[PDB]
Amino acid sequence: GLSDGEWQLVLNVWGKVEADVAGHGQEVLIRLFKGHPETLEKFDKFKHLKSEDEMKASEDLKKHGNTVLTALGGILKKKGHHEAELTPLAQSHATKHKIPVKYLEFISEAIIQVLQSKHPGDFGADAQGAMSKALELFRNDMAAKYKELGFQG
Ligand code: HEM
Numbered sequence: 001g002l003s004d005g006e007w008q009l010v011l012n013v014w015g016k017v018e019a020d021v022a023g024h025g026q027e028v029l030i031r032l033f034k035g036h037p038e039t040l041e042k043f044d045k046f047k048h049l050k051s052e053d054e055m056k057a058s059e060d061l062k063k064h065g066n067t068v069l070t071a072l073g074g075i076l077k078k079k080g081h082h083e084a085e086l087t088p089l090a091q092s093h094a095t096k097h098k099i100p101v102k103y104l105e106f107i108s109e110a111i112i113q114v115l116q117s118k119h120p121g122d123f124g125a126d127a128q129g130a131m132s133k134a135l136e137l138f139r140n141d142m143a144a145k146y147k148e149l150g151f152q153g
Contacts, residue, residue, distance in 0.1 A: 002133050007079045009130030014076055016119050017069060024114060025065025030055045032110035039103055072111075076134060082141070089146035100152050101143045108135040 017024045033040045033055060040046060044121065045064070049055050071089065075082045093099040112131060115123045123131075146152055 006133060008131045009127050010076060010134045011079075013115060013119065013122055013127045013131060014073065016122055017115070018073065021025060021069050021073070022062050022066040025067075025069040026056075026062045026116070027065075027114045028069065028110045029061055029065045029108065031113055032107050036103070036106045039106055041105075042097065042099060058099060058150055072138075073132070075138060080137065082124065082138075086138075086141050090142050090149065093142070094146050094149045095153045101139060101146060104139045104142055108132070108139060111135065125142065 030052060032045075033049075034052060040049075043064075046058070046061060049058060049061065055061055057110070075085050079084055080089075112128070115131065118126075
């Protein structure tokens with residue numbers, strides 16, 4: 001997994017995110033969308049946004065983003081022991097939202113791109129690998145539940 005040190009780099013870069021969840025959330029969504037338009041399609045709720053400007057205006061985009069990052073935040077802090085937490089999430093996304101794991105991959109990227117854009121100073125070579133490792137662990141586990149739930153294999 002992640003060493004204890006790796007988990008500390010992660011918990012650390014994450015306390016930056018917690019001083020502003022809604023704004024970090026909002027920018028990760030914008031980037032994912034601007035970046036994988038198709039992922040945009042998954043949200044009824046947001047298909048109708050046609051420009052960055054539009055995404056940036058959306059109260060509800062900003063709120064969905066808080067929610068996404070509040071939920072990851074809660075997983076991250078279990079530092080690995082996030083079975084109880086990952087479950088509801090893999091259930092909902094596998095079966096209701098129908099999110100492919102590739103998408104999880106896109107978001108991970110979106111998330112890392114925001115931390116680099118915003119915390120270049122706190123998000124060095126080490127914070128970088130800590131973080132991406134924590135996120136592949138998360139995808140990998142998501143992935144696992146899918147397989148079992150009997151999904152995208
Ligand atoms: C770090 C990755 C993610 C986290 C922590 C996350 C978290 C959440 C949470 C907490 C909810 C609300 C509760 C629930 O339905 O279980 C939700 C809903 C949803 N998620 Fe995600 N999600 C992630 C990635 C994605 C991705 C990549 C997509 C698809 C592009 C996605 C699509 C959706 C949709 C369509 C909804 C329903 C929102 C609505 O329309 O009310 N999520 N997600």
